[PDB]
Ligand binder design. Sequence first.
Ligand code: ML5
Ligand code: NAG
Length: 455
Amino acid sequence: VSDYVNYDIIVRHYNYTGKLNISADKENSIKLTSVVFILICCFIILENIFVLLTIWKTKKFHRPMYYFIGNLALSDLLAGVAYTANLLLSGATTYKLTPAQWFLREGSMFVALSASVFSLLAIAIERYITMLKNNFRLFLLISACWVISLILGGLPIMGWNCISALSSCSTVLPLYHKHYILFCTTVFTLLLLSIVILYCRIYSLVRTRNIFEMLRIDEGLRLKIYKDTEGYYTIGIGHLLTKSPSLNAAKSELDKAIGRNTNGVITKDEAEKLFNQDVDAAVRGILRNAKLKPVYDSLDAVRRAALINMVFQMGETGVAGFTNSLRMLQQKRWDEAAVNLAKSRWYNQTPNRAKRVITTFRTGTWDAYASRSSENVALLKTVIIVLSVFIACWAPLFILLLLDVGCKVKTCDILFRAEYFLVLAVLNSGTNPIIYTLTNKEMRRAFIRIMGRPL
Ligand SMILES: CCCCCCc1cccc(NC(=O)[C@H](N)CCP(=O)(O)O)c1
Ligand SMILES: *[C@@H]1O[C@H](CO)[C@@H](O)[C@H](O)[C@H]1NC(C)=O
């Protein structure tokens, strides 16, 4: 009987879980494991310092997303520091710690995890705000992100432990209460599930926003009925109301399409809902032709919309009337199809519009329409892979932890030799700096642009 700062508690906790007598196993190999993982940690420290340095040095990297990337780099930086301190205070030294020195040891790993989860979320929501639209509110969120992490990470210290309740002690973390691990595992899988559903929504809405903004320039937009260059009444994004030269006939067909009296003026949303009808019809027109559907299947989202834009102006037989171009498009030879369309009547009638459509087929990017909203495509695709790596590294531990909640003590063998799951989750701290320079050239260009020693 003494302060719950006595080393005997740690002995009883590893004794109950069955780790005290098996502590003297592979102790010589444990030294080889630690010294090597300490080197890997120091490499992770530099990696995240380099990520924090690039953002601090590049002016174009002073954007809200990069601030959350830096905050994520901080989570993975302090993770490496916490695991370097873990390896040093783990193994034989585990029994030389007090319960407080232990709840702080493994508590540091939880704080670093919680911070990474919220940091990822901070990047996830940021991507949803870029499509549809404040520096002081950003540092409040980063501060709140760490405050919630310090509470959700260190609350077992201030009460929620299992010191006198061995029946509720998890075997992979002896001094942690089984319910607390279940609470962390469920909160973090629920938060990681929120990211995945959000990114599926972001990638789908941007796909529909890219085809909208593309035709928002080529055929413009209108709230009131206007006559086209051919000689027929039109509204919104090239929606041909009638071929008849009667203004009231256009009002008749318009009111049938919307379902209310407009007198000629329609809402921005009513134009968009009418626009999807014109896109869907043009899309159906592609999936019904033996020369358009194979090409659409061989194209990407950017070049698919480029073909949709062509159908949106002329029609099914109109685009089918360029077999020489379509054949060169299906053969993945963009430069060859670019010349055929440049000499055709379509390029001679509307030169400024066809130029952008042809550039989309050649470049395969929205650079001919969006200036900086096109670069975000590569900047978003890379972040989805960051999350995909994170869920691949932590899920094995999360499953293992969930198994520890639903397993009697000294029963499940997987829970003992579970040092591999803990290491895979640690390695992830040095995969984000590596994934930036490999799946993002705009970030990689800034990274090399940073070779100054004193800087
Ligand atoms: C809910 C998710 C759990 C948070 C993950 C915290 C974490 C990350 C990485 C490692 C560890 N724990 C360890 O590696 C421990 N040193 C295991 C060995 P021991 O402490 O001796 O049982 C704990
Ligand atoms: C605790 O460890 C001691 C040796 O240090 C051993 O004799 C005892 O059986 C263990 N207690 C339980 C409940 O397994």
